[PDB]
C-alpha cells in the first residue's frame, strides 16, 4: 500500500497560481486521510473543487474546506456531517503540516488547515493527517493575501484537485 498523494491547483481571483501536492498519512490515520482523499477527487458527488480558503493568517495557517457555506460554518465529511478524532499520534511540528479544523472534540467535517509554522498549542486537539509534499512555495504565496484577522484580500480558490497516487 502506498500513502495517497492528492493535489490542489490554487487560483487567485481566477488567475492560476500553481499546484500543491500533499501526502496523506493513511497508514497512521486511515479514516481521516480517506475523508480528505475522497473530498479531493469529488467521488461522493461533493468535495473541494471550486471551494475557497476562507481564512488565512500569515505566520500561522491557511484554512479551507468549507464547500457548502464557504465561510467556516459548513462542510461535511464523507461519513455523515461529523466524525470522531481518530487519534493524535502526529504533531504540528512545522510548516507544511495538514490538520483538521473542528469545533471541539469529535467534530471533524471537511475543513482543514495547512500550517505555515510550528503550532504546538494545537497538539492533541486537532488531528494531523498529512503534509505538503511539493509546492510549499505556492502556500507561501497564498499567505501574502491573508491578514491578522484571517480575511483574504483576494479570493483564493481550489480551481481543481484530484489524486495523483
Amino acid at each position: 500500500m502506498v500513502n495517497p498523494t492528492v493535489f490542489f491547483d490554487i487560483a487567485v481571483d481566477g488567475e492560476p497560481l500553481g499546484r500543491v501536492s500533499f501526502e496523506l498519512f493513511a497508514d497512521k490515520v486511515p479514516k481521516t486521510a480517506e475523508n480528505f482523499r475522497a473530498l479531493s477527487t469529488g467521488e461522493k458527488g461533493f468535495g473541494y473543487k471550486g471551494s475557497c480558503f476562507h481564512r488565512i493568517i500569515p505566520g500561522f495557517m491557511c484554512q479551507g474546506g468549507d464547500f457548502t457555506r464557504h465561510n467556516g460554518t459548513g462542510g461535511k465529511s464523507i461519513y455523515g456531517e461529523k466524525f470522531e478524532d481518530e487519534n493524535f499520534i502526529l504533531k504540528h511540528t512545522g510548516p507544511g503540516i495538514l490538520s483538521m479544523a473542528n469545533a471541539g472534540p469529535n467534530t471533524n467535517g471537511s475543513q482543514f488547515f495547512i500550517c505555515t509554522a510550528k503550532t504546538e498549542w494545537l497538539d492533541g486537539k486537532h488531528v494531523v493527517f498529512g503534509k505538503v509534499k511539493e509546492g510549499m512555495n505556492i502556500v507561501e504565496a497564498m499567505e501574502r493575501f491573508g491578514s491578522r484577522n484571517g480575511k483574504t484580500s483576494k479570493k483564493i480558490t481550489i480551481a481543481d484537485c484530484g489524486q495523483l497516487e
Binding site: 481564512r55 479544523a101 469545533a103
Partner: peptide, 11 residues
C-alpha cells in the same frame, strides 16, 4: 488568539 475552529472563531 490563534485557533482553527469551524463556526465560532475565537481570539
Amino acid at each position: 488568539x490563534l485557533l482553527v475552529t469551524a463556526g465560532l472563531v475565537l481570539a
